[PDB]
Each structure stands twice: as structure tokens, then as C-alpha cells.
Amino acid sequence: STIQIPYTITVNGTSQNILSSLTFNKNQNISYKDIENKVKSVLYFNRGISDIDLRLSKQAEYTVHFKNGTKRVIDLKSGIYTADLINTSDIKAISVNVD
């Protein structure tokens, strides 16, 4: 009833050399604010980057990679959200990039 979705974190060009994943509910329609909440938690937990540190970074984005080969790039400092929902079982991976 849950699915693992792999993610990677890159901070100033250095990755983490780890295999790790996030837990989502299978086949659920969620928002990009739901996804942002999970990207921020792995930033804090794996790299020590809090909300304050994210606001003060030069650039901060994450990419949702979909299983049909497309992707969507979200700017974590924009405060803009499209008003859609996306399905958790359509997601291949998430990559986070903070410079």
C-alpha cells in the first residue's frame, strides 16, 4: 500500500553516494506542496539544511522525474505552485539541487 520513490541530494556539486528513498502512498493524487514538504525533510535530515538555510541559499530546486521520461523542475525559492495534483505511482525519482 506504500511505494518507495528514490531521491538524490546535491549540495554545491557534491552528492551523497547513497541509495535512499521516500515513502509515498501507492496511487495517490498529491500536490507539489506535499512533495516540497518531503524534499525539505530530507534536506534537513541528510544534509542539515533547514528552512532558514534554504531561504539563504543562492539557488535551490528539485526535479520530479516521471516514469514516461518527462520531468518537472521546481524552484524552491519561488513560492509559485501550479494548482494540480500528480499521482505518486507515476513518479520515477526526485533529484534535489542546492547551490
Binding site: 496511487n27 495517490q28 493524487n29 500536490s31 507539489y32 506542496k33 520530479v64 516521471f66 514516461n68 518527462t70 520531468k71 518537472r72 523542475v73 513560492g79 509559485i80 505552485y81 501550479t82 494548482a83 494540480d84 495534483l85 500528480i86 499521482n87 505511482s89 507515476d90
Partner: protein, 218 residues
């Protein structure tokens, strides 16, 4: 839709629900019996072969026999800019023609190039979140909004509810903005979370696309 009300049953027979594996994810508008209009970002990343287009719906948690359900056969875009969220409109051609009755009807569009002035009264609607923490709406919701030009840009139609925190929310993308009986916007994006009260909701400006939409139905 945060802070709206329930629509009357079948008061907007052009209102469409786009669903994936039985679950609503975006709105749309019926603009011909075999064509619906939505936001391009709603389909940019989905397997479009798996989208179900539900017409004549009111309570998405039930099995309403007034429903007509179609598949998507082709999509049409015209300059969609995901980076800047410009030209955020898509037309979906259905695998069939809907039967027109009291519950399922085709929307009317404005003339090409009609701009809405500051202060114009409109009606937004959708099946989106009832408020963050509260979950997706089951029964179609509608919300009175006003067109504003501050904190906006010319390539969008923006709207604001003043005095309370209200606006479109997640799942309302692609839903129509109705002003003076005509579809003038397609819900596109919010700023600073749902129903902030500071920043107006942003719609794709349908009036800029009428000649193109017409050329697609021919």
C-alpha cells in the same frame, strides 16, 4: 476551492473532471462535444492515454448515472512555456462526441482579444482541496472572485477574494473562470500557498486564444 460553497447540482454543465485511476486531478471545460479545454501543465507529465474525462458529474464519490466518460485521443498546445508558465492552455480531443442534454453542455467563449478590466466580477469553481489539511472536494465547489491587475501580469488573468482567505487550490488547475457567462480563464497557479489573501490566483487568459481554439474545431 478554499472558502467557497457547493454548486447547485448541474448548474455548470460544461464543468469537467479529469481523472487518473479513478481519482480527480484537474478540471476542464467542455468547449465542443468532442473537445475539452484544460491547463497544459495538467497533462505535460501524465500518460495521456490513461486520462478519463468525466462529464456531467457533481459528486465524484458516487456513481452518478448522469455521467458521460471519455478517453483522450489527442492534445493540442500553442506555445506552452513551462519555465515561465506562459500559454498554459491545452485542448484535449475526446474519443467520441458527448450527447448534449441538461447535464452536459458546451461552454461559450468570449470574442478574441477581450480583456477584463480591474474589478470585474467572476465565478471560479472546481473539485480541488477544500483547504490545506482538509482533502479533495467530493461535491463541485464555486467561489465568487474579482479580477485584479495589481501583482499580476498582462499574460494572465488574476483574481482575488478580499476580506477573507479564499481562492483556488490543488486540483482546481484547468477549471474555468466564468465572467458574464463566458469562459475567460483556466486556473493555472497560486503564489504563497492556497488562499493566502495577499497574492491573486493566476488564470490562463482564454480570450487570447479564441481564434486558435476555433481553428482546432474548424
Amino acid at each position: 476551492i478554499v472558502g467557497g460553497r457547493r454548486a447547485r447540482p448541474h448548474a455548470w454543465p460544461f464543468m469537467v473532471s479529469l481523472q487518473l485511476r479513478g481519482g480527480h486531478f484537474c478540471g476542464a471545460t467542455l468547449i465542443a462535444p468532442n473537445f475539452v479545454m484544460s491547463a497544459a501543465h495538467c497533462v505535460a507529465n501524465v500518460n495521456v492515454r490513461a486520462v478519463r474525462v468525466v462529464l456531467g458529474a457533481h459528486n465524484l464519490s458516487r456513481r452518478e448515472p448522469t455521467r458521460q466518460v471519455f478517453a483522450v485521443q489527442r492534445i493540442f498546445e500553442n506555445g506552452y512555456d513551462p519555465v515561465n508558465l506562459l500559454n498554459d492552455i491545452v485542448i484535449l480531443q475526446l474519443n467520441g462526441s458527448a450527447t448534449i442534454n441538461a447535464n452536459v453542455q458546451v461552454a461559450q467563449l468570449p470574442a478574441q482579444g477581450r480583456r477584463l478590466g480591474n474589478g470585474v466580477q467572476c465565478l471560479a469553481m472546481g473539485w480541488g482541496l477544500l483547504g490545506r489539511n482538509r482533502g479533495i472536494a467530493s461535491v463541485l465547489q464555486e467561489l465568487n472572485v474579482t479580477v485584479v491587475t495589481s501583482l499580476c501580469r498582462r499574460s494572465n488573468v488574476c483574481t482575488l477574494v478580499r476580506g477573507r482567505q479564499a481562492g483556488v487550490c490543488f486540483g482546481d488547475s484547468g477549471s474555468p473562470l466564468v465572467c458574464n457567462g463566458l469562459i475567460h480563464g483556466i486556473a493555472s497557479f497560486v503564489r504563497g500557498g492556497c488562499a493566502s489573501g495577499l497574492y491573486p490566483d493566476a488564470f490562463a487568459p482564454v480570450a487570447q486564444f479564441v481564434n486558435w481554439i476555433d481553428s482546432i474545431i474548424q
